[PDB]
């Protein structure tokens, strides 16, 4: 994915993806706490995805400086 | 490990000498390997869910690789392993020959 | 507590009575508090007489 997010745009596109994934994760945690859920790998996946999606931003800023 | 899953390996020691079989699974942290038709031990299982009848199943146990060796693809004879490059990537190669695997 | 000029201090040592009985003591200093400027600021600071002799300002 690295190349994908490094292709995408820093502030608007990528942050939109961030908040979208965070909404997803939120719903995941509710489904889990309720017991309506099966695929638990999604949670780890999404959290890691947000991490990469944020650190690309951080390196773009430090590249700016 | 000098061995992979999905081989045609030969046994060396144990009760099941003079024996051949493929591999069902490996375990590098333990240096152990499963083999079809080898060390087929009996396990006493209780009538618990996902076969709630229990009974005495019979299944292969692991063994240590050092008591196992692969085969010359040519002669079907036991060989030791070296490694060689062809087109980049390394490959297993059998002494007694320069034959792969 | 020390001379600003020299850095004299209240040093330590012994007191050997007749029969050389030893006891700890200090030799202080003849510091005197006098009005004098460090850089500016006439400061009213300690300084020793052994410094003050031979013409330093007060």
């Amino acid at each position: 994915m690295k190349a994908n997010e490094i292709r995408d745009l820093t502030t608007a596109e990528i942050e939109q993806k961030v908040k979208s994934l965070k909404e997803e994760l939120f719903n995941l945690r509710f489904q889990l706490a309720t017991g309506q859920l099966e695929n638990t790998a999604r949670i780890r996946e999404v959290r890691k995805a947000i991490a990469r999606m944020k650190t690309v931003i951080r390196e773009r800023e430090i590249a700016a400086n | 490990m000098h061995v992979k899953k999905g081989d045609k390996v030969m046994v060396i020691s144990g009760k099941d000498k003079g024996k051949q079989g493929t591999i069902l699974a490996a375990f590098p942290k333990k240096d152990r390997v499963l083999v079809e038709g080898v060390n087929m031990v009996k396990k006493h299982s209780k009538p618990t869910q996902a076969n709630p009848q229990g009974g005495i199943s019979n299944q292969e146990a692991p063994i240590h690789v050092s008591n196992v060796m692969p085969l010359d693809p040519k002669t079907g004879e036991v060989t030791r392993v070296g490694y060689k490059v062809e087109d980049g990537k390394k490959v297993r190669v059998a002494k007694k020959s320069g034959q792969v695997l | 507590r020390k001379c600003v000029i020299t850095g004299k201090k209240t040093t330590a040592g012994n007191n050997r009575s007749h029969a050389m009985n030893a006891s700890k003591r200090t030799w202080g200093a003849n510091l005197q508090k006098v009005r004098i400027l460090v850089n500016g600021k006439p400061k009213k600071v300690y300084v020793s007489a052994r410094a003050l002799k031979s013409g330093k300002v007060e």
């Binding site: 908040k19 965070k22 909404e23 994760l25 939120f26 945690r29 509710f30 889990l32 706490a33 309720t34 | - | -």
Partner: protein, 90 residues
Amino acid sequence: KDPRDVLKRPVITERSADLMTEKKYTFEVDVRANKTEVKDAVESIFGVKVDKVNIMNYKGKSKRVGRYTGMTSRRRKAIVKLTADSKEIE
């Protein structure tokens, strides 16, 4: 900061059932947050208004596993009272 990060998860008990019958729901929350934060969080997420909020915080139950006797994590649960003329939630 985000409301999604504010809220953590709900609490499914017969108490919570009895309360969502009476329109007031419950949650559990990060320990630092406060009543107004969670209120605006709900309003921003579910698009629903609020009558009031009542908030709590529990300590960590000690436990035992073999010799090992650690402590459970703390909890900050929050009861929110929807208005009438307000939506419900899944």
